[PDB]
Amino acid sequence: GMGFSSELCSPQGHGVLQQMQEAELRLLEGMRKWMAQRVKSDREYAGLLHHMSPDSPISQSWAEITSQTEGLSRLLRQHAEDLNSGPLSKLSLLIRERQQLRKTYSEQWQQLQQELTKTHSQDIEKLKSQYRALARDSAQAKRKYDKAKDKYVRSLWKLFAHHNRYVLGVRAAQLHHQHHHQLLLPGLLRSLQDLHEEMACILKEILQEYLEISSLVQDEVVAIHREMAAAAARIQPEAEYQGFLRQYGSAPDVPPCVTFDESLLGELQLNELTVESVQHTLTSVTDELAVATEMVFRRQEMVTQLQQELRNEEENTHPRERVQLLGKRQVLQEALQGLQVALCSQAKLQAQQELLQTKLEHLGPGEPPPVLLL
Amino acid sequence: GMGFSSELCSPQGHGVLQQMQEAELRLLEGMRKWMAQRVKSDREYAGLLHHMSPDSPISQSWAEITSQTEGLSRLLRQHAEDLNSGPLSKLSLLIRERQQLRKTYSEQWQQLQQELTKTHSQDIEKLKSQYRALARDSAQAKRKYDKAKDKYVRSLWKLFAHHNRYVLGVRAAQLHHQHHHQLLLPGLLRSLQDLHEEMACILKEILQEYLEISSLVQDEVVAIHREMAAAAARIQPEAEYQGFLRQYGSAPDVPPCVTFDESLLGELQLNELTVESVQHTLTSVTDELAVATEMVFRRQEMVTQLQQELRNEEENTHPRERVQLLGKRQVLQEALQGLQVALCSQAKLQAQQELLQTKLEHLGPGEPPPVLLL
C-alpha cells in the first residue's frame, strides 16, 4: 500500500510533509477560533434568553413556559463552559504537541542527512584524497629505487595499510546508505504518518465531543421543550375563570323593586272622569308597542346577519388566525345588547297595555262608575 | 354552573371584572416584551453563529460542519422573523381589541345603570312628588266645598288622571327592574365571559405558535445536527493521507551508493606487511561491535519500557482523553529512531568485521603473502 515511508522517501517529499504539518496547524488554529466563537455565541444567547425574565390555568402555564425558558438559558451557559473546558482545551493541546512534531521531525530528519553525508561522502573523500597522496608518494620512492628500498618499503607499508582502511570505510558507507534508505528514513516517515493518523482519531473525537455539547436537539433541550409544550397544552380556555369566580364570586345584588306607595292615597281608577283618559292611553301605548316591536325586529335581523356572517368566517379561518374575528364578535356583542334593551322597552309597554286592556274589559258594557262626593 | 352572569351580577362584581381586564392586559403586555426579547435573542445568536465562519476526509467533513452551522445561523434568523410577524403581531392585536372591550363593557354597563336609575327611581319620584301635590291640591278644594264643586271636580279629575299615569310608571319600572337583573345585566356579563374564554383560546394558540417557531429541537434543527454528526462520523483517520499520497507521492530518491574507486589503484590486501595491521583491526572492530550491541540493548530496553507504559495508559484512558498520550508517543518516537541508528551503527561494524575475519581465514595457516618488488 501507499505511505509516507514509501511515497515521500525523498528530499522533495520532506518539503511536502513540512508544508502539510503547517497546513494542518493552520486548519486546527481556525477550528480553535471557530469553537471559541461558539463559546461566545452560547454565553451571550444564555444572557439574551436570561434577560427575557392568580390561580389561572394560563397564569400557571405562563409561569412554567417562562421558568423553563430560564432552564434553557442556564443550559446554553453550561454548553459554553463544557465546550471551553472540554474539546476547545483539547484542541489547544493538539496544536501545542503538533508544534513540537514540526521541530522534532525536521531536526531528526536533518540529523539522519548529516550522518549519511559524513559516512557516505565526507569520510570517503578524506580516505580517497589520502589514498591518492600515499599512492603518488610510493610511485616517487619506486622511481628513486640501499636506502631507496627501505623508504619505498615504508611507502608501500602505509599505502596498503590505508588501502585496507579505505576498504572498511567503503563497506561502512555502503551499509549506512542501505540502513538509511531501507530502515532509518522509511522508519521515520512511517512513525510521522502513524502519529498523524492517531491525531486524526483525536480530532474526530474532539469534533464529535463539540457536536454533542453544542447540540440544541440533545435530550436535555427536548426535555425542556416538552415541559413548555405540555404547559401550553394544559390551558383550558372554558375553565379559565372557575377559580376566579370561587374567590371573587358573590350572590346577585338585586335591590328592592318599585311597589305602588300607599302613603299617597296599584289599581287603575276607572270612573266617569278617567274612562276617556284610559281609552286614549291604551291607543297611544298600543302605537308605542308596535313601534317597539318594529325596533326589536330590526335589531334581531341585525343580530341574525352578524351571527351568520361570523359562522361563515369561523368556517373560513385557520384556528390560529381567529384573533381577526374579535372585531366582528364585539360588533355582534353591541347588536345583542341593543336587541336585549329593545325587548326590555317592548316588554315595559306590553305590561302597561295589559293593565289598561284588563281594566277596560272588567267594566265591559257597564256604565263608567260615577264619582260619589259625600 | 358558575359564571360572570350569576356570580359577578353586582356593582362589586363590576369592579372585580374591570380589574381582571387590566390585570390580563398587564400580563399580555409582559408576554409581548418577553416574546420581543426572544426575537432579539434569536437574531443576535444568528449573528453570533454567522461570525464563526485539499481532498482530505477531515477537510471535506470540516467544510460540511462549518457550512451546516451557517445553515443553523440562517434558521435562527427565520425563527425571529416568523415570531415577529406571527404570534407577536397577533398578541399586539389581542391587546388592541382588549383595550376597546375595557371602554365598551364599562360604558355599556353604566348605560344600563342610567336607564334603571331613570325608569326605576327618577321617573317614579317625579310621579310621586306630583301625586302628593295633586292630592293636597284636591284636599284644599274639598275643604273649600256652586264654584267649589267645579274646582273640586277638576282637582279630582287630574288626581285620578295622575294616579293612573303613576300606576303605569310603576308597572314600567317593575318590568325594567325584572329585565335589568334577569336579562340585560346577566346577558352582558355572559357575553364578556364568552369573549374572554374565546381570547383564552386565541392566547393558547398564540403561545403554541411561539413554541413551534422558537423550537430549537424541531425537525429542521435535527436535520442540520444529523448532517453535522454524519460528516464527523465519515472521517476515516487511517484513510486521511491516501489522496495526499496519490498527488504529492513519488518514487524513493536513492542516490548512487559508494563503490570502491578503481582510479586510486574492493579487496583487503593481506600480505607480510598488512597481516599484523589486519589482526589488530579485527580485535578493535570486535571491541566496537560489542559496545554497539550493548548500545542497541539499552535502547531496545528503553523502547520496550515506553511501549509497555503506553499499552498500560491506552487501556486506562477514555477514548476522548487520548490527546494526553501524544507526549509519551513522541518520547517513544525518539527512542525508536535512537534504536534504529544503534542498529545501523552495529550493522556497519558487523560488515567491517566480516571482511577482516573472511580474509584472515582465506589465508588460514598459510605464510603471509610476501611483497614482490620487480
PDB file of C-alpha atoms in Angstrom, chain A residues 116-317:
ATOM      1  CA  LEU A 116      24.836   9.850   5.751  1.00  0.00           C
ATOM      2  CA  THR A 117      26.786  12.890   4.330  1.00  0.00           C
ATOM      3  CA  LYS A 118      29.607  12.175   6.892  1.00  0.00           C
ATOM      4  CA  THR A 119      29.879   8.331   6.465  1.00  0.00           C
ATOM      5  CA  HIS A 120      28.806   8.121   2.740  1.00  0.00           C
ATOM      6  CA  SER A 121      30.562  11.263   1.306  1.00  0.00           C
ATOM      7  CA  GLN A 122      32.870  13.273   3.682  1.00  0.00           C
ATOM      8  CA  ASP A 123      34.786  10.363   5.394  1.00  0.00           C
ATOM      9  CA  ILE A 124      35.148   8.573   1.963  1.00  0.00           C
ATOM     10  CA  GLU A 125      36.550  11.722   0.181  1.00  0.00           C
ATOM     11  CA  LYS A 126      39.153  12.149   3.030  1.00  0.00           C
ATOM     12  CA  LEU A 127      40.134   8.423   2.599  1.00  0.00           C
ATOM     13  CA  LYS A 128      40.204   8.912  -1.252  1.00  0.00           C
ATOM     14  CA  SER A 129      42.388  12.114  -1.085  1.00  0.00           C
ATOM     15  CA  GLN A 130      44.898  10.331   1.271  1.00  0.00           C
ATOM     16  CA  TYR A 131      44.908   7.139  -0.944  1.00  0.00           C
ATOM     17  CA  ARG A 132      45.956   9.418  -3.899  1.00  0.00           C
ATOM     18  CA  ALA A 133      48.712  11.114  -1.774  1.00  0.00           C
ATOM     19  CA  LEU A 134      50.204   7.788  -0.453  1.00  0.00           C
ATOM     20  CA  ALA A 135      49.939   6.217  -3.994  1.00  0.00           C
ATOM     21  CA  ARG A 136      51.874   9.201  -5.540  1.00  0.00           C
ATOM     22  CA  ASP A 137      54.300   9.189  -2.512  1.00  0.00           C
ATOM     23  CA  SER A 138      55.016   5.434  -3.202  1.00  0.00           C
ATOM     24  CA  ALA A 139      55.407   5.985  -7.020  1.00  0.00           C
ATOM     25  CA  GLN A 140      58.154   8.610  -6.233  1.00  0.00           C
ATOM     26  CA  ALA A 141      60.061   6.114  -3.963  1.00  0.00           C
ATOM     27  CA  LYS A 142      59.773   3.389  -6.716  1.00  0.00           C
ATOM     28  CA  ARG A 143      61.442   5.769  -9.282  1.00  0.00           C
ATOM     29  CA  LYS A 144      64.118   6.717  -6.639  1.00  0.00           C
ATOM     30  CA  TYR A 145      64.754   2.902  -6.262  1.00  0.00           C
ATOM     31  CA  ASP A 146      70.219   0.650  -0.317  1.00  0.00           C
ATOM     32  CA  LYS A 147      68.053   3.344   1.445  1.00  0.00           C
ATOM     33  CA  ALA A 148      65.736   3.624  -1.649  1.00  0.00           C
ATOM     34  CA  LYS A 149      64.459   0.071  -0.766  1.00  0.00           C
ATOM     35  CA  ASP A 150      63.715   0.981   2.920  1.00  0.00           C
ATOM     36  CA  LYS A 151      61.905   4.305   2.074  1.00  0.00           C
ATOM     37  CA  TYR A 152      59.972   2.516  -0.782  1.00  0.00           C
ATOM     38  CA  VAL A 153      59.099  -0.365   1.676  1.00  0.00           C
ATOM     39  CA  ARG A 154      57.629   2.224   4.169  1.00  0.00           C
ATOM     40  CA  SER A 155      55.665   3.994   1.335  1.00  0.00           C
ATOM     41  CA  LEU A 156      54.058   0.604   0.351  1.00  0.00           C
ATOM     42  CA  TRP A 157      53.507  -0.355   4.074  1.00  0.00           C
ATOM     43  CA  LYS A 158      51.299   2.787   4.564  1.00  0.00           C
ATOM     44  CA  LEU A 159      49.661   2.701   1.049  1.00  0.00           C
ATOM     45  CA  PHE A 160      48.456  -0.916   1.752  1.00  0.00           C
ATOM     46  CA  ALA A 161      47.532  -0.012   5.405  1.00  0.00           C
ATOM     47  CA  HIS A 162      45.468   2.989   4.081  1.00  0.00           C
ATOM     48  CA  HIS A 163      44.016   0.881   1.165  1.00  0.00           C
ATOM     49  CA  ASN A 164      42.533  -1.555   3.791  1.00  0.00           C
ATOM     50  CA  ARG A 165      41.355   1.416   5.989  1.00  0.00           C
ATOM     51  CA  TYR A 166      39.594   2.821   2.830  1.00  0.00           C
ATOM     52  CA  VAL A 167      38.050  -0.656   2.006  1.00  0.00           C
ATOM     53  CA  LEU A 168      36.496  -0.779   5.554  1.00  0.00           C
ATOM     54  CA  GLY A 169      35.329   2.885   5.162  1.00  0.00           C
ATOM     55  CA  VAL A 170      33.547   1.965   1.849  1.00  0.00           C
ATOM     56  CA  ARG A 171      31.813  -1.113   3.457  1.00  0.00           C
ATOM     57  CA  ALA A 172      30.693   1.096   6.440  1.00  0.00           C
ATOM     58  CA  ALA A 173      29.421   3.758   3.928  1.00  0.00           C
ATOM     59  CA  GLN A 174      27.664   1.058   1.773  1.00  0.00           C
ATOM     60  CA  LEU A 175      25.758  -0.402   4.803  1.00  0.00           C
ATOM     61  CA  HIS A 176      24.823   3.139   6.081  1.00  0.00           C
ATOM     62  CA  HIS A 177      23.331   4.005   2.609  1.00  0.00           C
ATOM     63  CA  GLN A 178      21.475   0.619   2.921  1.00  0.00           C
ATOM     64  CA  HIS A 179      20.168   1.246   6.517  1.00  0.00           C
ATOM     65  CA  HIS A 180      19.416   4.958   5.652  1.00  0.00           C
ATOM     66  CA  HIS A 181      17.165   4.358   2.565  1.00  0.00           C
ATOM     67  CA  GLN A 182      15.654   0.983   3.768  1.00  0.00           C
ATOM     68  CA  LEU A 183      15.227   1.427   7.595  1.00  0.00           C
ATOM     69  CA  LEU A 184      16.215   4.870   9.095  1.00  0.00           C
ATOM     70  CA  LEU A 185      14.371   7.342   6.741  1.00  0.00           C
ATOM     71  CA  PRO A 186      11.438   4.967   5.899  1.00  0.00           C
ATOM     72  CA  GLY A 187      11.160   4.180   9.680  1.00  0.00           C
ATOM     73  CA  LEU A 188      10.917   7.958  10.462  1.00  0.00           C
ATOM     74  CA  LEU A 189       8.282   8.677   7.716  1.00  0.00           C
ATOM     75  CA  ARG A 190       6.314   5.565   8.938  1.00  0.00           C
ATOM     76  CA  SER A 191       6.309   6.974  12.555  1.00  0.00           C
ATOM     77  CA  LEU A 192       5.243  10.512  11.369  1.00  0.00           C
ATOM     78  CA  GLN A 193       2.259   9.006   9.407  1.00  0.00           C
ATOM     79  CA  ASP A 194       1.141   6.655  12.281  1.00  0.00           C
ATOM     80  CA  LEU A 195       1.211   9.639  14.760  1.00  0.00           C
ATOM     81  CA  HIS A 196      -0.683  11.913  12.249  1.00  0.00           C
ATOM     82  CA  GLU A 197      -3.337   9.113  11.842  1.00  0.00           C
ATOM     83  CA  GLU A 198      -3.521   8.948  15.716  1.00  0.00           C
ATOM     84  CA  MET A 199      -4.029  12.794  15.758  1.00  0.00           C
ATOM     85  CA  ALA A 200      -6.777  12.358  13.065  1.00  0.00           C
ATOM     86  CA  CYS A 201      -8.534   9.978  15.577  1.00  0.00           C
ATOM     87  CA  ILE A 202      -8.091  12.628  18.383  1.00  0.00           C
ATOM     88  CA  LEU A 203      -9.575  15.429  16.153  1.00  0.00           C
ATOM     89  CA  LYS A 204     -12.627  13.286  15.099  1.00  0.00           C
ATOM     90  CA  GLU A 205     -13.335  12.588  18.846  1.00  0.00           C
ATOM     91  CA  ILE A 206     -12.730  16.342  19.656  1.00  0.00           C
ATOM     92  CA  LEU A 207     -15.155  17.366  16.804  1.00  0.00           C
ATOM     93  CA  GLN A 208     -17.789  14.755  17.912  1.00  0.00           C
ATOM     94  CA  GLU A 209     -17.424  15.967  21.579  1.00  0.00           C
ATOM     95  CA  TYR A 210     -18.051  19.574  20.297  1.00  0.00           C
ATOM     96  CA  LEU A 211     -21.226  18.453  18.379  1.00  0.00           C
ATOM     97  CA  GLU A 212     -22.692  16.627  21.478  1.00  0.00           C
ATOM     98  CA  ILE A 213     -22.043  19.574  23.918  1.00  0.00           C
ATOM     99  CA  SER A 214     -23.143  22.211  21.290  1.00  0.00           C
ATOM    100  CA  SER A 215     -26.274  20.102  20.355  1.00  0.00           C
ATOM    101  CA  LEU A 216     -29.538  22.180  20.574  1.00  0.00           C
ATOM    102  CA  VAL A 217     -31.557  18.957  19.756  1.00  0.00           C
ATOM    103  CA  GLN A 218     -29.999  16.815  22.600  1.00  0.00           C
ATOM    104  CA  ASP A 219     -32.217  15.018  25.212  1.00  0.00           C
ATOM    105  CA  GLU A 220     -31.914  17.832  27.866  1.00  0.00           C
ATOM    106  CA  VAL A 221     -33.186  20.527  25.374  1.00  0.00           C
ATOM    107  CA  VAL A 222     -36.083  18.188  24.256  1.00  0.00           C
ATOM    108  CA  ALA A 223     -36.921  17.612  27.999  1.00  0.00           C
ATOM    109  CA  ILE A 224     -37.432  21.437  28.443  1.00  0.00           C
ATOM    110  CA  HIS A 225     -39.325  21.966  25.091  1.00  0.00           C
ATOM    111  CA  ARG A 226     -41.772  19.127  26.089  1.00  0.00           C
ATOM    112  CA  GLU A 227     -42.337  20.710  29.585  1.00  0.00           C
ATOM    113  CA  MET A 228     -43.076  24.045  27.742  1.00  0.00           C
ATOM    114  CA  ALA A 229     -45.492  22.418  25.187  1.00  0.00           C
ATOM    115  CA  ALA A 230     -47.167  20.340  27.998  1.00  0.00           C
ATOM    116  CA  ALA A 231     -47.784  23.617  29.975  1.00  0.00           C
ATOM    117  CA  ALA A 232     -49.361  25.384  26.907  1.00  0.00           C
ATOM    118  CA  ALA A 233     -51.477  22.233  26.119  1.00  0.00           C
ATOM    119  CA  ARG A 234     -52.794  22.148  29.775  1.00  0.00           C
ATOM    120  CA  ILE A 235     -54.543  25.580  29.231  1.00  0.00           C
ATOM    121  CA  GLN A 236     -58.375  25.010  29.346  1.00  0.00           C
ATOM    122  CA  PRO A 237     -59.976  28.210  27.903  1.00  0.00           C
ATOM    123  CA  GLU A 238     -63.520  27.311  29.202  1.00  0.00           C
ATOM    124  CA  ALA A 239     -62.115  26.632  32.760  1.00  0.00           C
ATOM    125  CA  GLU A 240     -60.050  29.914  32.872  1.00  0.00           C
ATOM    126  CA  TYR A 241     -62.394  31.864  35.256  1.00  0.00           C
ATOM    127  CA  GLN A 242     -63.653  28.963  37.503  1.00  0.00           C
ATOM    128  CA  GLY A 243     -61.082  29.628  40.312  1.00  0.00           C
ATOM    129  CA  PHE A 244     -61.616  33.414  39.739  1.00  0.00           C
ATOM    130  CA  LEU A 245     -65.413  33.034  40.414  1.00  0.00           C
ATOM    131  CA  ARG A 246     -64.868  30.840  43.576  1.00  0.00           C
ATOM    132  CA  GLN A 247     -62.884  33.645  45.376  1.00  0.00           C
ATOM    133  CA  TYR A 248     -64.368  36.918  43.918  1.00  0.00           C
ATOM    134  CA  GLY A 249     -67.905  35.497  43.250  1.00  0.00           C
ATOM    135  CA  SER A 250     -70.991  36.628  45.281  1.00  0.00           C
ATOM    136  CA  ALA A 251     -74.850  36.404  45.169  1.00  0.00           C
ATOM    137  CA  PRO A 252     -76.534  38.835  42.688  1.00  0.00           C
ATOM    138  CA  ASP A 253     -77.170  42.365  44.149  1.00  0.00           C
ATOM    139  CA  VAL A 254     -80.937  42.793  43.332  1.00  0.00           C
ATOM    140  CA  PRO A 255     -82.276  45.993  45.021  1.00  0.00           C
ATOM    141  CA  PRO A 256     -85.887  46.195  46.340  1.00  0.00           C
ATOM    142  CA  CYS A 257     -88.350  46.649  43.381  1.00  0.00           C
ATOM    143  CA  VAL A 258     -90.877  49.552  42.889  1.00  0.00           C
ATOM    144  CA  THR A 259     -94.184  48.731  44.722  1.00  0.00           C
ATOM    145  CA  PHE A 260     -97.116  51.250  44.486  1.00  0.00           C
ATOM    146  CA  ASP A 261     -96.715  53.579  47.547  1.00  0.00           C
ATOM    147  CA  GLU A 262     -99.858  53.588  49.818  1.00  0.00           C
ATOM    148  CA  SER A 263     -98.722  56.868  51.563  1.00  0.00           C
ATOM    149  CA  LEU A 264    -100.029  58.920  48.533  1.00  0.00           C
ATOM    150  CA  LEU A 265    -103.696  57.649  48.712  1.00  0.00           C
ATOM    151  CA  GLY A 266    -101.753  49.676  42.459  1.00  0.00           C
ATOM    152  CA  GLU A 267    -105.191  49.690  40.694  1.00  0.00           C
ATOM    153  CA  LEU A 268    -106.168  51.912  37.676  1.00  0.00           C
ATOM    154  CA  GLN A 269    -109.188  54.032  38.846  1.00  0.00           C
ATOM    155  CA  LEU A 270    -111.829  53.558  36.054  1.00  0.00           C
ATOM    156  CA  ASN A 271    -114.653  56.090  36.846  1.00  0.00           C
ATOM    157  CA  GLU A 272    -116.777  58.503  34.669  1.00  0.00           C
ATOM    158  CA  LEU A 273    -113.878  61.089  34.588  1.00  0.00           C
ATOM    159  CA  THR A 274    -110.883  58.742  33.840  1.00  0.00           C
ATOM    160  CA  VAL A 275    -112.689  56.399  31.317  1.00  0.00           C
ATOM    161  CA  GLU A 276    -111.821  58.531  28.190  1.00  0.00           C
ATOM    162  CA  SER A 277    -108.234  59.093  29.559  1.00  0.00           C
ATOM    163  CA  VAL A 278    -107.804  55.244  29.860  1.00  0.00           C
ATOM    164  CA  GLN A 279    -109.293  54.619  26.326  1.00  0.00           C
ATOM    165  CA  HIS A 280    -106.744  57.094  24.760  1.00  0.00           C
ATOM    166  CA  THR A 281    -103.743  55.792  26.850  1.00  0.00           C
ATOM    167  CA  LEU A 282    -104.365  52.192  25.540  1.00  0.00           C
ATOM    168  CA  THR A 283    -104.481  53.644  21.939  1.00  0.00           C
ATOM    169  CA  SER A 284    -101.111  55.504  22.426  1.00  0.00           C
ATOM    170  CA  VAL A 285     -99.387  52.620  24.387  1.00  0.00           C
ATOM    171  CA  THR A 286    -100.519  50.201  21.565  1.00  0.00           C
ATOM    172  CA  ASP A 287     -98.991  52.639  18.965  1.00  0.00           C
ATOM    173  CA  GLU A 288     -95.703  52.674  21.030  1.00  0.00           C
ATOM    174  CA  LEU A 289     -95.593  48.811  21.417  1.00  0.00           C
ATOM    175  CA  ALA A 290     -95.998  48.303  17.595  1.00  0.00           C
ATOM    176  CA  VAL A 291     -93.014  50.746  17.096  1.00  0.00           C
ATOM    177  CA  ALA A 292     -91.074  48.942  19.930  1.00  0.00           C
ATOM    178  CA  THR A 293     -91.806  45.524  18.236  1.00  0.00           C
ATOM    179  CA  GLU A 294     -90.619  47.139  14.921  1.00  0.00           C
ATOM    180  CA  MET A 295     -87.360  48.126  16.780  1.00  0.00           C
ATOM    181  CA  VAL A 296     -86.908  44.526  18.176  1.00  0.00           C
ATOM    182  CA  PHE A 297     -87.354  43.177  14.566  1.00  0.00           C
ATOM    183  CA  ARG A 298     -84.607  45.476  13.076  1.00  0.00           C
ATOM    184  CA  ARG A 299     -82.106  44.503  15.868  1.00  0.00           C
ATOM    185  CA  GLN A 300     -82.867  40.705  15.637  1.00  0.00           C
ATOM    186  CA  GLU A 301     -82.364  40.962  11.798  1.00  0.00           C
ATOM    187  CA  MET A 302     -79.064  42.833  12.618  1.00  0.00           C
ATOM    188  CA  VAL A 303     -78.037  40.071  15.154  1.00  0.00           C
ATOM    189  CA  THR A 304     -79.026  37.274  12.649  1.00  0.00           C
ATOM    190  CA  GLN A 305     -76.980  38.959   9.818  1.00  0.00           C
ATOM    191  CA  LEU A 306     -73.876  39.349  12.111  1.00  0.00           C
ATOM    192  CA  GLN A 307     -74.284  35.766  13.553  1.00  0.00           C
ATOM    193  CA  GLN A 308     -74.436  34.175  10.018  1.00  0.00           C
ATOM    194  CA  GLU A 309     -71.502  36.423   8.836  1.00  0.00           C
ATOM    195  CA  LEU A 310     -69.426  35.137  11.848  1.00  0.00           C
ATOM    196  CA  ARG A 311     -70.339  31.422  11.196  1.00  0.00           C
ATOM    197  CA  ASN A 312     -69.129  31.985   7.558  1.00  0.00           C
ATOM    198  CA  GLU A 313     -65.748  33.434   8.792  1.00  0.00           C
ATOM    199  CA  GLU A 314     -65.431  30.797  11.629  1.00  0.00           C
ATOM    200  CA  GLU A 315     -65.516  28.106   8.839  1.00  0.00           C
ATOM    201  CA  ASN A 316     -63.061  30.024   6.517  1.00  0.00           C
ATOM    202  CA  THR A 317     -60.352  30.969   9.128  1.00  0.00           C
TER     203      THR A 317
END
